[PDB]
Design a protein around this ligand. Structure first.
Ligand SMILES: OC[C@H]1O[C@H](O[C@H]2[C@H](O)[C@@H](O)[C@@H](O[C@H]3[C@H](O)[C@@H](O)[C@@H](O)O[C@@H]3CO)O[C@@H]2CO)[C@H](O)[C@@H](O)[C@@H]1O
Length: 456
């Protein structure tokens, strides 16, 4: 459990938590502060349940796409590093973790998918997605396959869909518009249709996930896979001679992977914020800190400039960064949740044949665009009435109601955050104010008197 005088960190199990634990032991050796790293299941979903409780972590690690919601709900502490420290990380990595003009996390590394081919089976990897059907059958003649990758998570199948024109939300004037969802445009329809055709000619199987796809490549059963740097570790241990190169082109235009920024967010309810800032700045985000984690599971291209020149020499990094520039940086807005869920539903149905491509994408468009609107009213729907609300609207689509749950859980962390604040323990002042300002006249007076009290 969390309490004053120690750090608890959450990171996804596919990353190098053991190496991260090493960095904390140094910290513990230098400060006497016990550092404990955990890797829970679905920490992306478990966090918004337990953040503002005594069961949430001090530091949370995830790609930058989740943090906008976290931030909007006032569940993160404003990161306040000196200019000299900011000038040690790449500026565009700071953009990712910047939401509404405020820094909400420490950017760690850059994550971008890449084509991971087996050199023993593929000296000249294909340049285009349209070459692959011919190569696979040639490998079918060897009882082999050309490609296998996780098909259950939309993270991995997006690069092909967004190649010719598909996108999440339109970007313009330096801003995203959540009403313009580019999941059902011409460029998106072609990518998925091309993907399914690969499966329908049984160049792939729909049940392929990370665990199995990983096994396939690691045992030299498929010539290619698509995965991130964190996966090179297990592959390095396996006896496969592999290469990491650029993703294949499609219709002249490259497959555009959503680029990820691994980021470290400080719980606003953590009683050891400065204690955390000390760790991330002066231990992890150092040439040795990052080296310790990378040795466990490769991070990719780090945001720390001093240690990026070190990794840039690795061709597998050069491959990723190329794909990174070719692809797009994930938005960090609170609506990316609505976008992901809708797509996760669409691909599984268009892959299992349960629906047309035109249908799933049409439905995903609607559900995402609609569910994306729920966030603008998250703070308005008065307290005790969020379930009555969403039940009043009665949308009932599985991916839509998933956002409802999330939002319903955000509102529950803010009430909890308010509870902590009332009892004089750490709390995020935004989560507090959002809760009072929907708690009738009594909330608003309580809200403002604090705003006035706070003016000291
Ligand atoms: O659809 C279910 C799932 O959608 C969301 O997951 C997305 C992540 O938010 C997003 O960061 C990305 O996930 C990848 C990570 O960025 C990266 O760290 C790496 O480890 O691979 C991840 C893919 O497994 O893309 C996924 C969509 O697949 C949402 O976060 C989840 O709550 C939700 O369960």
């Amino acid at each position: 459990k969390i309490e004053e005088g120690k750090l608890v960190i959450w990171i996804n199990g596919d990353k190098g938590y053991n190496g991260l634990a090493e960095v904390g032991k140094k910290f513990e050796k230098d400060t006497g502060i016990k550092v404990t790293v955990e890797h829970p299941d679905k920490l992306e979903e478990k966090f918004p349940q337990v953040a503002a409780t005594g069961d949430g972590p001090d530091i949370i690690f995830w790609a930058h796409d989740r943090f906008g919601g976290y931030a909007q709900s006032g569940l993160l502490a404003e990161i306040t590093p000196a200019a000299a420290f900011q000038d040690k990380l790449y500026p565009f990595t700071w953009d990712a973790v910047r939401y509404n003009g405020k820094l909400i996390a420490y950017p760690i590394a850059v994550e971008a998918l890449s084509l991971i081919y087996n050199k023993d089976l593929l000296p000249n990897p294909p340049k285009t997605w349209e070459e692959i059907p011919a190569l696979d059958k040639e490998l079918k003649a060897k009882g082999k396959s050309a490609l296998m990758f996780n098909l259950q998570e939309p993270y991995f199948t997006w690069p092909l869909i967004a190649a010719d024109g598909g996108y999440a939300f339109k970007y313009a004037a330096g801003k995203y518009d959540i009403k313009d969802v580019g999941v059902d445009n011409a460029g998106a329809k072609a990518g998925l249709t091309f993907l399914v055709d690969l499966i329908k000619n049984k160049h792939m199987n729909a049940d392929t996930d990370y665990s199995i796809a990983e096994a396939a490549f690691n045992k030299g059963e498929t010539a290619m896979t698509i995965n991130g740097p964190w996966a090179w570790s297990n592959i390095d241990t396996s006896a496969v001679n592999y290469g990491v190169t650029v993703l294949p082109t499609f219709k002249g235009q490259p497959s555009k992977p959503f680029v990820g920024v691994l980021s470290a967010g400080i719980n606003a309810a953590s009683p050891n914020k400065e204690l955390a800032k000390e760790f991330l700045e002066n231990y992890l985000l150092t040439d040795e800190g990052l080296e310790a984690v990378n040795k466990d599971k490769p991070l990719g291209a780090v945001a720390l400039k001093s240690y990026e020149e070190e990794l840039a020499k690795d061709p597998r990094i050069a491959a990723t960064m190329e794909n990174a520039q070719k692809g797009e940086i994930m938005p960090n807005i609170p609506q990316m949740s609505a976008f992901w869920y809708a797509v996760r539903t669409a691909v599984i149905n268009a892959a299992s044949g349960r629906q047309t491509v035109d249908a799933a994408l049409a439905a995903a468009q609607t559900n995402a665009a609609a569910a994306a609107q729920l966030y603008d009213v998250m703070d308005a729907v008065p307290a005790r009435r969020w379930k009555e609300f969403v039940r009043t609207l009665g949308l009932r689509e599985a991916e839509i109601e998933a956002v409802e749950v999330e939002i319903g859980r955000f509102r529950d962390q803010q009430y909890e955050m308010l509870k902590r604040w009332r009892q004089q323990q750490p709390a995020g002042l935004g989560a507090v104010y959002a809760a009072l300002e929907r708690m009738g006249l009594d909330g608003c007076v309580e809200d403002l008197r604090s705003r006035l009290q706070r003016l000291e």
